[PDB]
Design a protein around this nucleic acid. Sequence first.
DNA 1: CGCTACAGGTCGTCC
DNA 2: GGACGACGTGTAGCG
Lengths: 239, 239
Amino acid sequence: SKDKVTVITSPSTEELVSLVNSALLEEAMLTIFARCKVHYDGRAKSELGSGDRVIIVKPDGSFLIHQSKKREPVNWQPPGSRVRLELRENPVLVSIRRKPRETLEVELEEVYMVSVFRAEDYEELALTGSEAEMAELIFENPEVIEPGFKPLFREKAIGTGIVAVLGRDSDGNIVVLELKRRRAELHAVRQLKSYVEILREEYGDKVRGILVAPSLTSGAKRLLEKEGLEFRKLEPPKR
Amino acid sequence: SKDKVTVITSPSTEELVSLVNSALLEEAMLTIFARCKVHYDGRAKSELGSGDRVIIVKPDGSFLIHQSKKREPVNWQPPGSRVRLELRENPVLVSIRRKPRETLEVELEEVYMVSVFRAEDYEELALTGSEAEMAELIFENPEVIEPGFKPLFREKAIGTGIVAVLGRDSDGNIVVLELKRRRAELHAVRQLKSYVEILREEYGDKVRGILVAPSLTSGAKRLLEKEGLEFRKLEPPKR
DNA sequence: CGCTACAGGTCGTCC
DNA sequence: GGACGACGTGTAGCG
Ligand SMILES: [Mg+2]
Ligand SMILES: [Mg+2]
C-alpha cells in the first residue's frame, strides 16, 4: 500500500479482484486496459460492442472509458457514482449514480492490464483569460467599453435571466453588456436581445445592449444590427 | 513490442523515450503515471503545479491529463495535435495544436509508470434517446404534436439560425418546433422566440411556436407563457 | 436540490 | 473552413 503504482499484466481473476478492490478501499486511481463491451442506461441508452479501451475509475467515483480516438470518453459516470466489480460469465464493472439513476456496465472480456495508482496531488489549476476576468477588467477600467460608461452590477438577476454586467452611460441610460471570451455567436446575441427587451419594458427604448467579445460571426452581426444592438471589441485578459 | 501491452515502472530516460517513441510510431495509446507540472497557453492560459496525474496520449493526437478528481481532464489537447518529447532538465511532453495555436507542456518530474497499449477497436458507440430521435418520431408520427400537424422541414436554415422542425397546422398556420431531449431551460425558449419572430417577419401573425420537451424549468415556462408560445410534453424515445 | 449560464467546452453537419 | 446547435454535455455560483 506504500508503492505509488501496482501493475499487473494479464492478471488472473483473483489478481483483478485483489487490485480492483484495493484501489477502491485505498481510494486510489484504478486504470485498466481491456477488451470489453459497454452498456449504459440513464438519461439516454447506449451499446458499445467488443473492443479494446482504457478504463479509469477515480477515487471520487468518476468513471471514464476511452477509445483510441477523440477527446471525449465514449462512456462515463460522474463524480459520486459507486462501482462494484461483479463476477459473472466475465468480470463486470458496474457503476451506478443515484439522481438521476444511471447505470454503466463494463463487461471485461480480456484484461490486458490492471493498475492501482496512489496519486498524491495537492495542487489545483490556475487559469486566466476567462469571462469573469473580462468583467473585472471592465469594472477596473470601464473605458475599454467607452468613455463615461459606469459599471454597476455583475450577474444581476433581472426578471427572467441573469445579465453579465448592468450599467449606465454618460447619457444616463441603462446599459446591458453580454460578454464572450471568444468569438460571439447567434446564441450570445439572443441572450443580450432577451435581456434588453425585458429591461426595455421597464426602462423604455433608450436601453442599450452591447455585445462585448474579441470578434463575432456573420450571423451575430446581422442579428445585432437588425435589433439595434451594439458591439465592442474586447480580448479576454491573461494574467 | 509484439505484445498488446508494454509496461515499465520507474523508467530510465532511455526507457521513457523508447516507449513514447514506439507509442507514436505504432499508433498505440500512451499512458503515463507521473508527478508533473503543466503549462498551457492558447485560447486561454493556465498553470498546474507539481502533483501526480494520469497522462494519456491517443494515436489521433488527443492528449489528456487527469487529476484524481472529476470527469474532466485538468488540461488537454484535441485530436490532431502533434506531440514530441524534449529532454530538458526533466523530460517534457510538448503537444501543440495548430489553428488556433495552442501549446501544452508537461514537465515530467518523476515518471512512476509508462505504458504502450496497442488497442484494437473496430466498434462504434450506438446511442439512443437523442433529440434527432425525437424529430424522427415526429415525422413518423406528427399527432404526437397535435392532430393534422404537417411536418415539412428538419434542421432548416431560416435566415438567421436553424430550426429543429418546421411545419404547418390544420388551420394553415406555420409551426416552429424547438425540441429538447431534456428539461427545457431559458436557452431553448430564447431559440424558439427568436425563430418565430424571424418567421413572423415573412409570414406575419400566422406563425406558432411550440417547445417540445419532457419538461420545463420555471424560467422557461414563465418566459414561454409571457410570449404566448406553446409547450408539448415529449420524452426522447429509447429505441 | 433546481435554475442559470460559462467552458481552453468537444463534436458533427452543412452552407 | 466558418456557422450553428446538440450534448448522457460537465462544472460553478447562487437561492
Ligand atoms: Mg452572460
Ligand atoms: Mg434547436
